């Protein structure tokens, strides 16, 4: 008789998910192919604070023996992800961020923690952007970035990926911002394609200036990463109709599905750990007091196959098969699905780019 796992699931209040379904979530899967049994304890939150989070986690740990934690909220911050990383590093618990502020990717995690997230990295976003550009025979482009962190690695990855094809790219220039020193920079661009990299509050101004000078219209394709197109239905007054952007699939991927996927991943990792060494690690006694050196779950989830699909991670906390999608801002002024990323090849639905005109 193998043992069973105790998993704690914390979810946001404003997700239209009842607490009964959380503890009856095994019914839809009928335990599926789960190697081990799971006892689920369900807790609901509305908005998290640095002290409320800690109190909740320590109270959960005191009551019973905890083997995992699936966290998903509705607050949109990166401080929540940082706090989850800190708590995991301090208590030796595997934590999965699946939705909300936890799902936001963060680089250079602490090497003694076990925090993993459901999200795509900037390198993968650049990969899909380059794939779409190559698919629409846009072999000439330009790069416009700002001082916002990540631009160095973005540019480096762009160059390295550019230099290696049977296509033959024709990159033009790399303009960086540090009207008396940037007027020059904005006067040296002609290529239709313009890959931008900044925040929204700077993108609005850059795009407005480009429009007012004459960088918008029929043939001027602006592509921006998921950082510039974040919260949907918050479109500013000046975003041209015909933008192309990448975003994580929030239209067909459901919370009920991703919680079940996280449970499957944790169960498979624990089963692999038990098979090798005959014990499953757990959390410590309590938060308040005064290092698990043998083994951790940090090596048994290098590859994990569950229910056919490969749910494995990488060595840095990234997925191998993220569910990225491609969106466009159509005439009715909202983002619309235009293409899907799956396996290693995108699948567009138009196959010849329609003409989107901006600003009437």
């Amino acid at each position: 008789g193998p043992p069973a796992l105790n998993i704690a699931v914390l979810l946001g209040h404003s997700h239209d998910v009842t607490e009964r379904e959380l503890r009856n979530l095994w019914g839809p899967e009928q335990a599926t192919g789960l190697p081990l049994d799971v006892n689920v304890v369900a807790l609901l939150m509305n908005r998290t604070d640095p002290k409320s989070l800690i109190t909740h986690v320590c109270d959960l740990m005191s009551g019973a023996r905890i083997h995992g934690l699936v966290f998903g909220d509705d607050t949109d911050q990166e401080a929540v992800a940082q706090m989850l990383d800190f708590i995991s590093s301090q208590t030796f618990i595997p934590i999965l961020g699946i939705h909300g502020g936890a799902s936001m990717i963060m680089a250079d995690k602490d090497p003694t923690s076990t925090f993993f997230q459901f999200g795509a990295s900037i390198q993968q976003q650049a990969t899909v952007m380059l794939k779409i550009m190559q698919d629409y025979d846009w072999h000439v482009f330009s790069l416009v970035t700002t001082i916002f962190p990540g631009y160095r690695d973005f540019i480096s990855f762009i160059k390295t990926t550019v230099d290696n094809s049977f296509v033959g790219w024709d990159m033009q220039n790399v303009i960086t911002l540090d009207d008396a020193k940037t007027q020059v920079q904005l006067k040296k661009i002609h290529s239709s394609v313009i890959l931008l990299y900044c925040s929204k509050d700077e993108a609005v101004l850059i795009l407005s200036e480009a429009r007012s000078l004459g960088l918008t219209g029929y043939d001027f394709f602006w592509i921006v990463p998921s950082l510039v197109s974040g919260n949907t239905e918050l479109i500013p007054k000046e975003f041209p109709s015909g933008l192309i952007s990448v975003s994580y699939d929030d239209w067909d991927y459901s919370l009920e599905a991703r919680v079940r996927d996280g449970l499957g991943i944790l169960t498979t990792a624990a089963s692999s750990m038990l098979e090798k060494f005959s014990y499953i690690p757990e959390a410590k006694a309590s938060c308040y007091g005064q290092e698990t050196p043998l083994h951790t779950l940090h090596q048994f989830m290098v590859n994990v196959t569950w229910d056919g699909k490969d749910l494995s991670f990488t060595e840095e906390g990234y997925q191998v098969h993220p569910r990225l999608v491609v969106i466009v801002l159509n005439k009715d002024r909202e983002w619309e699905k235009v293409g899907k990323w799956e396996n290693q090849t995108l699948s567009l639905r138009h196959a010849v780019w329609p003409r989107y005109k901006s600003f009437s």
């Epitope: 069973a4 369900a42 060494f277 014990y279």
Partner: antibody, heavy 119, light 109 residues
Framework: QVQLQQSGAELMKPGASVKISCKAT????????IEWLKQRPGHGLEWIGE????????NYNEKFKGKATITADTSSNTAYMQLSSLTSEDSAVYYC??????????????WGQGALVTV | DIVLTQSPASLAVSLGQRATISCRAS??????????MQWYQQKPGQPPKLLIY???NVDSGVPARFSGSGSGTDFSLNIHPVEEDDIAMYFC?????????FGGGTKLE
């Protein structure tokens, strides 16, 4: 089936130290925690500490901290309890118990016979 | 910790009707919808035996005459009918806080 067995009775001129064994012959000895309890002459029970043989982690009670040492031997499937500096208050019966890892509570299911130490 | 209390210390009941035992705790033991309370039976000279776990679930392999219910901080256990089984002591144990604590016991005749 899971079975636990302990040593016999003990007796010692005051001032010695005692060691008690508990053997498991029905499961994977390195997966389930083992707990030790004390029972005085018929007025209650207490809790000393627990040991996980697979990883070697140990936790104790502050009342019995520094008095009882819990050790395990993964080869002979024996759990060892080391009481030191016996006094007149250490005449009691002890049990080794192990739960079943299928529930959310922390209960005791399998019990040994128990050994009566006398000072 | 959590300090339990059992009343009455000694109980004397006729054979046939029923027996009732109460065990009230100092603090609440509920843990996200699952109260943590266990009842034990200990014959003289023998290790105890688990009867009820989680304060409402009976244990497989035990007679159906045993049953327990309660929530919050007040808990109870009632057995019916009375037979030659209820000649031992009974205890209550909480597992909400480390370390675990037991009751004081209660005899029957």
């Amino acid at each position: 089936q899971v079975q636990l067995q302990q040593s016999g009775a003990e007796l010692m001129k005051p001032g010695a130290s005692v060691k008690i064994s508990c053997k498991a012959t029905g499961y994977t000895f390195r997966s389930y925690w083992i707990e030790w309890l004390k029972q005085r002459p018929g007025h209650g029970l207490e809790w000393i500490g627990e040991i996980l043989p697979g990883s070697g982690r140990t936790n104790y009670n502050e009342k019995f901290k520094g008095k009882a040492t819990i050790t395990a031997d993964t080869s002979s499937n024996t759990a060892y309890m080391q009481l030191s500096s016996l006094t007149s208050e250490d005449s009691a019966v002890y049990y080794c118990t192990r739960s079943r890892g299928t529930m959310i509570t922390r209960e005791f299911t399998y019990w040994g016979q128990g050994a009566l130490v006398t000072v | 910790d959590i300090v339990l209390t059992q009343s009455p210390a000694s109980l004397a009941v006729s054979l046939g009707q029923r027996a009732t035992i109460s065990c009230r705790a100092s603090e609440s033991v509920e843990y996200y919808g699952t109260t943590l309370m266990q009842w034990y039976q200990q014959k003289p000279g023998q290790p105890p035996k688990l009867l009820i776990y989680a304060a409402s679930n009976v244990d497989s392999g035990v007679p159906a005459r045993f049953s327990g219910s309660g929530s919050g901080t007040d808990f109870s256990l009632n057995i019916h009918p009375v037979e030659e089984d209820d000649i031992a002591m009974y205890f209550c144990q909480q597992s909400r806080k480390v370390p675990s604590t037991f009751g004081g016991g209660t005899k029957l005749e």
